[PDB]
Each structure stands twice: as structure tokens, then as C-alpha cells.
Amino acid sequence: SGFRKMAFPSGKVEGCMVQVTCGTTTLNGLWLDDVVYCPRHVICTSEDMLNPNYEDLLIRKSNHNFLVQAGNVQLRVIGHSMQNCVLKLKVDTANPKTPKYKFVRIQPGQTFSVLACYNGSPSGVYQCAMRPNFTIKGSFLNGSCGSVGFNIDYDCVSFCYMHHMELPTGVHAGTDLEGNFYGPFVDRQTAQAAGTDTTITVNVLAWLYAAVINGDRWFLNRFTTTLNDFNLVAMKYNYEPLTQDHVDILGPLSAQTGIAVLDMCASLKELLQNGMNGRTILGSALLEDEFTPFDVVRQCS
Amino acid sequence: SGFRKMAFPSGKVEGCMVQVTCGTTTLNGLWLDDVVYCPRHVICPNYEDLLIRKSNHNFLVQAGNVQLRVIGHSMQNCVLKLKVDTANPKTPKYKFVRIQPGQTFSVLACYNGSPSGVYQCAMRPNFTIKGSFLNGSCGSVGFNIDYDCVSFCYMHHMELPTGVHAGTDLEGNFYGPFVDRQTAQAAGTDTTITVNVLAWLYAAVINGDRWFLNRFTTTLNDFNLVAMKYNYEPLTQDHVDILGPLSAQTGIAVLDMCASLKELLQNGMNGRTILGSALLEDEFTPFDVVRQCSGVTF
């Protein structure tokens, strides 16, 4: 019993964190085999950031300009290439701590663990969700760029995020490990704003199922709803539309608890209408949306 | 910016997790040097009587896909120490520390000697932890990291009927009035860790949340008279001193922040949130706030 926001064990990722220094700029890199991945803005100055021409800035660099540090050992850069917004630094040593890994691009609503690093050293691990507006509500300070987001299902680390920037609202934007940004963001200091955020509906429903599995039933009601009527109500509270995919995904939790998805949708409609009335669900006074249906099944079963 | 419930990087502890099987019971062990530490209920009570009947070859210890050979066994309070032939090459610099209620630590939840998740939690004033543990999680450990030294402070033993968890320090001494036996046991009435709520209000100020601040201050005695009424732990002069750096960084005196907390307790938040929470968070110590809002690494 119990429900916690749980991150994956960070050990496999810790052994990949390195420090990347280019001029006055120092950030984190991900050392996998003989390649160190890092945000390409490591080659920029604060001046270059407004309208940088990364191809132009990168052609002027040589391998000895990139100082890569793995613990107390300096790695030797033997090549460099750019793939979208990520810089790939070919090094002369393959990381012996390289785990079984994949590069996966995630969809909004998906969760992952973040190993926050500064100067190539891990400081903490926390759980995140890719928000519907493609930002992440992380905890990042200056020097955290290059910190990665990941999932460790089985013995394979799926890297899904690399931190690149903080938006004016304190939310974070980054790319997958192929350098493609999540969202309409660019690695420039030009005016950028996160779009209006929405609540990840399928995740709130999954978390209501986790509460039922943990013995919390006060929020359940005798009502059901059509999928369309649920969405018409949900949209008014800035909740993401619930698709038939989401309803299918929630099927196992619906079978395990005996509460139909549209039946749980009716509880959610009621919670949106009434609030909690001094009550909590899984120790929270708000509806939690950073637990996917997969996270709930993994943690509860 | 941002404030998250953050656990320590679990790598140093992951390299210590092993599977311990004795009879029908399989749980987790902590392999440090040539000793595997695990809950003594793995032999299950008269634990001295049950242990004298066991031989080394009854404990099947597994580190990944390698079976460790047990060469001795002894009991220290509620922990079983299995002397093994092989010293763990991944043994980090470590200490066994007993924590006080209100202190936080990271839990590496394991099943079958394999780590599945890491989460940050707090030793409740009633000596329980609000963890996330399923069957097979016994032997999962709680820890903090100081520079490069892992301070092990908790080993999971049981779940109480309310879904909260009870365990021991690494010397086998339970936190709280709990015993490792199937009997009627209940967690005492819980209280809110006051110094931690104040630390979390300072973290909100550092992050730009100031709506809860007021022009008022309070005496330490008047704050405690109010705090006792809301099942909050008494705030000591130690706590006020500990909050000193956050008070200096934000420009808000501790007793000034106490008066904001007093208003939050009598009036509520009024549809508002603090750091994305509609409740006052008490599982961040003053040190956790300083570490996160300054970025200390390991």
C-alpha cells in the first residue's frame, strides 16, 4: 500500500553524466559509448543566443575547444557533429558504464525521471510529466542544461529528454536525444512563451483508480457519462480531451477495480464541480495528473 | 526555478542491493563489504531460537546473477547480518545513522534484490513513514548522501493497517514503538513537521510565491500555542536557528514566516496554491530547501 511520486533508480544514468565546457560555458553531457550528447547552445555566448547560426559557430570550433570531464578524468574529443539542437562529441574512450539504452521521443502526458546535474555531477532525481503544452515543470538552476529525462523499464534506459532552457514562467523546455525540441520552442533567447497548460485527464483518471486500489472511494458516484459529455465538461476546467485511446488504456484499471472508465469519468466530473470539500485523495488536496495509467499499474501491482 | 520532491541519486545504493531467500521468504538485503544486512523476520517469534536452527546454506543470497556464499550469521536487534565470502566491490563510503522525526531521506524500493524506484520521504513525528511498499519490499533502505558518503538510516520491515510503514535504523532498532511480529500494532496520532512547513514556505518565497506573506510577526510561545491546536509539532529555538539562512536569503524573519503560517492555519489558502500544492508540505527539511535552491551535487 501507499502511493508516492516515484522516480526510477538513477544509477544507470549517473554513470553517463559528464561535464562539457566550451569557452565560458559549462553544462552537462550524456556519455554513451564513445559519444557525449549535450545541448548545442554550449557553443554560444550570451550574445550569440538571440539569433545564433549554429552551423556557422560549430564550423569555427575544433575538437580541443570542447573540454569534456568524466569525474576526475578529462576525455579527449576526436570529432563533433550536430543533430538538430544536440551536439554530439565523439570521444576517444567508450564509457564502460554505458547501460543498455534507447532514444525514445515521448508524447504529452508521458512521465519520466529527471536526474538533475550541475558540472557533470548528479544532485537529485525527481519525477516529471511532459505537459500538454510540451513544457516540463522541473526544478532546474543555471548549469542544469544537459540534465536528462528517462524511463528504466526492465534493464534498458530509455532517454527521452535533455534539458535546454527555462521559459519566463519558470517552466522548462528541452529536446528528445535526437535534438528535436518538444513543443514550438527554439534554442534562442528570442521571446518564447509556454502555451496555456491543461490537465492530463487520462493521468488524473489513472490516479483516481490508484486511490480506489488503495481504499479511497469517497469520490465515487452512481453516475456514468458519455465520452462526449465528459469532454464538454472537462474542456471547461482546462482538462485535455479524453480520447477513445485513453479509455482503452484505462481498461485494465477499470477491470481491476470494477469501475467502468465512463463511470470514473463521472466521478471526475463531480470532483471538478464540487472540489474536495476538505478531503484528500492519496494525500493530495488537488487532482494529480503526473501518474500515467502505466505508472499506476507498475506501482500498485 | 521549480521545486520538486527530489530524492538523492540512488546509484551508490543500487550497487548494494541483493536478494535474500530463506525458506519461503524472499526479501532484500544491503551488501556492504562482506556483510549482507536484512530484516530478521526473513527466518520467520523467538528470533534467537529460530536463528540457532538455521545454517549458512539455508540463506540463499543473490547479487544480480551471482549467488553469494554465506559463511556466518548473527543478529543485531531486528536486523540479521549475513557474513558472506565476497566483499562487495561496489561498496561506497558509508555510515549507519539513526535519524530523528522530521528528517527526510530517500528510499530505494526493491523487489527480489532489484531496485524499482526511488522516492523522497520523511520520518513522521509518529515514527512511521508514508512510503510506497508492496509485498517483497522488506529490506528496502532509506538513505541520505553527504558529499560522497551514503548515510543509511532506514530498513523497511512492515506495513501497518493504515497503509503507513515501519522499519529500523541499520543497527536493527525500530523507529517508533513497533515490534517485528504479527500482532495488533497501530501508528500513533500524526503531527505536522512545523520546521519543514516553514522551510517549504521559504522555498515558495525563493520561487516567487509571496501571497501568503503578511506584515505580522509572532512570539515563539504564541506560535506554539496556535501550532499545538492544529496538531503541528512544537517549533523549538533549534528550528528557528536552523531556518536562519533561509530567513537571511529571503529577508523574512522566522517568527515573521511563523505569523504567515498561523494565518494559513486559521484561514486556509482560499482556493490558492503554494508551490503547486493546496496543502502545507512538511516533507522538505530546511537543508533540503537550501540544497535544492542552491544545487549541491553528489
Ligand SMILES: CN1C[C@@H]2C[C@H]1CN2C(=O)C[C@@]1(C(=O)Nc2cncc3ccccc23)CCOc2ccc(Cl)cc21
Ligand atoms: C552562454 N549561455 C549560458 C548557457 C549556454 C548559453 C545559453 N545558456 C542557457 O542555457 C541560458 C538560458 C536558460 O534557459 N538556462 C537555464 C536552464 N534551466 C534553468 C535555468 C534557471 C535559471 C537560469 C537559467 C536556466 C537562459 C537564457 O535564455 C535561454 C534561451 C534559450 C536557451 Cl536554449 C537557453 C537559455
Ligand SMILES: [Cl-]
Ligand atoms: Cl509516450
